């Protein structure tokens, strides 16, 4: 619920070590947490907030050029000058090119001409700055259990619905206590501060589409920066970069704009972040979070109830969804009240006894009537199996066959485990919980190799990454000691891998 | 007396959007604009869940075709040796100054 | 000759035939049929949201 067929969803099976589980929440997917007991909570992280902001510089895309009134002097009555340079809103380049007797020296040669253009802009970047305080990552909680996929309707934004629960966690108030009526209060403690390394990311405006970029990138743009303090009379530093004075070889000088540089700036943004803004925030997609999810306070809700009665009519053909579960949604007819929902995956029927480990524990229907409306999920075994609730006369049975083998789930799972190591990595070891001398020593080594690596090979586009990959490969086929060849080939191989994993 | 050999549009105005949204194993989404000529289309696969509402789950095959438009094209105007010219000037110092 | 707006400069037939932008052919009557178009109008999506 709230995450099904959502793809990047990762379910964590069992917190372990005393109701403590830490998880990394990235917008590109979900995390559905299932314990030995307690409802199966489905966490999905949506959006991000940008708060107060601030402006840093600006950049002009488009240059109006007017005036250009020129001044020339004799071969010797110094170099040229005219009143318009003290204006500082103009741009002038004194180039010594002209000739004698034409204009008038009686002194063949040289000449100095100042050419001053009026520089006013039109479209301009603001380039605002982000600081980690005050941005809260909105996060949505969705517990499974009894649910249609709407039908209850009322969402749980404000509450009612009582199945889900919005949490907004900000570095000035982490520990977002979330109250799920009748299940339990799921508290979770997240660090907004340290996840994305903000303060290295300027929030960047163009016309409408907004982006995020490095200060390291954003200070290096060759545009007539502004200082962004205030307007009233914008004072353009540079102006030299965006206008070009082309002197003709035979005689004279021309002022020529470089025209709107707008699109070129789009090209230079390859690999930004796609961003959405509003007046007081600017919805930030992407991102990732780290949170220790505290399962201490929860209850399976109505563990204690009857088994209902006769129904089992199911609405749809379970639908073999991606990665794992066949997500079932029945309508036991005629039930009296808040009674349990029996479900089991049977290897063979025959003597009942399923091994299925369904991920939707203690499912519970609601009130009387008949509209019912309960949706479940069951993880069957890869082989053929029978989906069965085993109540009443002749119940209703279903025949289902999963595909793929434990080997396939093995390779598949490490495939993504690698991508967790690839993007956001060095926090990937935070996906597992209650670690010591396995997951911490691990995250430690990976963090040192990560910092060195990023420091060593920063400045790496995808193509570059592949090249240096192959060079380190070719060294890995040569030299000596089986060390620098093996260390070298190793680190080369990991770039190649991080490249392909970036692309996929 | 110059010709025009091709042109480039250095600006762009997109318009009209829409989208496909057909389910998985419904085959393909149509939306008729891939028929008409200036509407650019790139078919992508939306892994599609129950929110949208379809039977299976997986790559959903939609493409938004937005109608291209242009403004202020740059022309490539071309020439040949014909319809060329020079207009050379002559000096002959002699005795003059200014004419 | 290469005309953008009210300025003009020569370019060979390599830099000029190498440009990725739309082709357009010879003339502009009405509105032309724009060859290519992939260079401008770049559209992709993630999270599988339209």
């Amino acid at each position, epitope marked *: 619920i709230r995450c099904i067929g959502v793809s990047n969803r990762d379910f964590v099976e069992g917190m372990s070590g005393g109701t403590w589980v830490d998880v990394v929440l990235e917008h590109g997917g979900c995390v559905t947490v299932m314990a030995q007991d307690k409802p199966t909570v489905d966490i999905e992280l949506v959006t991000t907030t940008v708060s107060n902001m601030a402006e840093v510089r600006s950049y002009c895309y488009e240059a109006s050029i007017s005036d250009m009134a020129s001044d020339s002097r004799c071969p010797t009555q110094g170099e040229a000058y005219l009143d318009k340079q003290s204006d500082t809103q103009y741009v002038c380049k004194r180039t010594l090119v002209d000739r004698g007797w034409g204009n008038g020296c009686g002194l063949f040669g040289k000449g100095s001409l100042v050419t001053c253009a009026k520089f006013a802009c039109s479209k301009k970047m603001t380039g605002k700055s982000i600081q980690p305080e005050n941005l809260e990552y909105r996060i949505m909680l969705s517990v499974h259990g009894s649910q249609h996929s709407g039908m209850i309707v009322n969402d749980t934004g404000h509450e009612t619905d009582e199945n889900r629960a919005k949490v907004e966690i900000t570095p000035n108030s982490p520990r977002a206590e979330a109250t799920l009526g009748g299940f339990g209060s799921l508290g979770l403690d997240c660090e907004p501060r340290t996840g994305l390394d903000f303060s290295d990311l300027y929030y960047l405006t163009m016309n409408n589409k907004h982006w995020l970029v490095h200060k390291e990138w954003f200070h290096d743009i060759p545009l007539p920066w502004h200082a962004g303090a205030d307007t009233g009379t914008p004072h353009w530093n540079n102006k030299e970069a965006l206008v070009e004075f082309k002197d003709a070889h035979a005689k004279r000088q021309t002022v020529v704009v470089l025209g709107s540089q707008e699109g070129a700036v789009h090209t230079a943004l390859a690999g930004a972040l796609e961003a959405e803004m509003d007046g007081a925030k600017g919805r930030l997609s992407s991102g990732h979070l780290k949170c220790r999810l505290k399962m201490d306070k929860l209850r399976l809700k109505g563990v204690s109830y009857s088994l209902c009665t006769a129904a089992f009519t199911f609405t749809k053909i379970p639908a073999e969804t991606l990665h794992g579960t066949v997500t079932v949604e029945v309508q036991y007819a005629g039930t009296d009240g808040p009674c349990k929902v029996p479900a089991q995956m049977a290897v063979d029927m025959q003597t009942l006894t399923p091994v299925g480990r369904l991920i939707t524990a203690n499912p519970v229907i609601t009130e009387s*009537t008949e509209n019912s409306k309960m949706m479940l999920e069951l993880d069957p075994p890869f082989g053929d199996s029978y989906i069965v609730i085993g109540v009443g006369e002749k119940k209703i049975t279903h025949h289902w066959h999963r595909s793929g083998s434990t080997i396939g789930k093995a390779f598949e799972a490490t495939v993504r485990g690698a991508k967790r190591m690839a993007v956001l990595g060095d926090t990937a070891w935070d996906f597992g919980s209650v670690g010591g001398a396995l997951n911490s020593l691990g995250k430690g080594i990976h963090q040192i190799f990560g910092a060195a690596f990023k420091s060593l090979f920063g400045g790496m586009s995808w193509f570059s990454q592949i090249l240096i990959g192959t060079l380190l490969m070719w060294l890995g086929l040569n030299t000596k000691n089986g060390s620098i060849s093996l260390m070298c080939l190793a680190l080369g191989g990991v770039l190649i891998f991080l490249s392909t994993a970036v692309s996929a | 007396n110059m010709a025009e050999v091709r042109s480039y549009c250095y600006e762009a105005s997109i318009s009209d959007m829409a989208s496909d949204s057909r389910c998985p194993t419904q085959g393909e989404a149509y939306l008729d604009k891939q028929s008409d000529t200036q509407y650019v289309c790139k078919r992508t696969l939306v892994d599609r869940g129950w929110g949208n509402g379809c039977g299976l789950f997986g790559k959903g095959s939609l493409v938004t075709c937005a109608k291209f438009a242009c403004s202020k094209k740059m022309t490539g105007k071309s020439i040949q040796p014909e319809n060329l010219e020079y207009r050379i000037m002559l000096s002959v110092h002699g005795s003059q100054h200014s004419g | 000759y290469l005309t953008m707006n009210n300025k003009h400069w020569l370019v060979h037939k390599e830099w000029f035939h190498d440009i990725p932008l739309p082709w357009h052919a010879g003339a502009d009557t009405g509105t032309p049929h724009w060859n290519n178009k992939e260079a401008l109008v770049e559209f992709k999506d993630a999270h599988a949201k339209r």
Partner: antibody, heavy 127, light 109 residues
Framework: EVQLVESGAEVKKPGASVKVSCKAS????????MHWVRQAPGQRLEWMGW????????KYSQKFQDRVTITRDTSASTAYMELSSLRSEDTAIYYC?????????????????????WGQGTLVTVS | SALTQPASVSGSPGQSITISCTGT?????????VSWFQQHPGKAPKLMLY???SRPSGVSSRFSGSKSGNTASLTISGLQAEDEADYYC??????????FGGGTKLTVL
């Protein structure tokens, strides 16, 4: 709990600019929703809508791709649908209804239900 | 894209009535989106269906939806006294726009 009111769309002349307003009441608009469905007397409910939210986006029925627009103002939780040129045939009632928006604030796939509440309706006449 | 449901069908209190909405593969058949709007002459068409069935919170069991291809069958039985209203069938086309059937005004008793 949820109130949707409009101010009446009397009758203009064929060639008139009619603007109808929808005042969201009680229900939080924040990320709210909206729609416009005009039906003429006992008519084929027409959907000339605009999927608006907080962001202010729109998508118009092929029939009003460029005839009418409805800007958002969250100062008063009001949507303004403006159909340029009220010709004679329009006499129908423009209702404003909501299909509350997705979590993300971006609206693509609507909710299973569409319209849980409706405007009072506005009769606008071309005469 | 248009909705052709029937104009008005009559039935006595208690016997069941069936309204048929026939769409395209582009809207009704190729999606689960269907909704039936009860429109009284007086009040705005209000939600009373949504996705085949799933009563919203005014179940008044007597309304049931169904689909068989491009069909939408809202089958009311047990005529609800003064349940007479125009019934409109709606669907989400894939082009991203909504269409509403020509409406079925109903006759009761």
């Amino acid at each position: 709990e949820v109130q949707l009111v409009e101010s009446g769309a009397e009758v203009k002349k064929p060639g008139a600019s009619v603007k109808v307003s929808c005042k969201a009441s009680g229900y939080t608009f924040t990320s709210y929703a909206m729609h416009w469905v005009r039906q003429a007397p006992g008519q084929r409910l027409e959907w000339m809508g605009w999927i608006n939210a907080g962001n202010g986006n729109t998508k118009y029925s092929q029939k009003f791709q460029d005839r009418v627009t409805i800007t958002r103002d969250t100062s008063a939780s009001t949507a303004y649908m403006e159909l340029s040129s009220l010709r004679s045939e329009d006499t129908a009632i423009y209702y404003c209804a909501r299909d509350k928006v997705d979590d993300y604030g971006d609206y693509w796939f609507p909710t299973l239900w569409y319209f849980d509440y409706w405007g009072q309706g506005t009769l606008v006449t071309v005469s | 894209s248009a909705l052709t449901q029937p104009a008005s069908v009559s039935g006595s209190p208690g016997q069941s009535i069936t309204i048929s909405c026939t769409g395209t593969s582009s809207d009704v058949g190729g999606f689960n989106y269907v909704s039936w709007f009860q429109q009284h002459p007086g009040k705005a068409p209000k939600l009373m269906l949504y996705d085949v069935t799933s009563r919203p919170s005014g179940v008044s069991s007597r309304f049931s939806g169904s689909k068989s291809g491009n069909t939408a069958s809202l089958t009311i039985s047990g005529l609800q006294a003064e349940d007479e209203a125009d019934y409109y069938c709606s669907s989400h086309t894939s082009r991203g726009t909504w269409v509403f059937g020509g409406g079925t005004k109903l006759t009761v008793l």
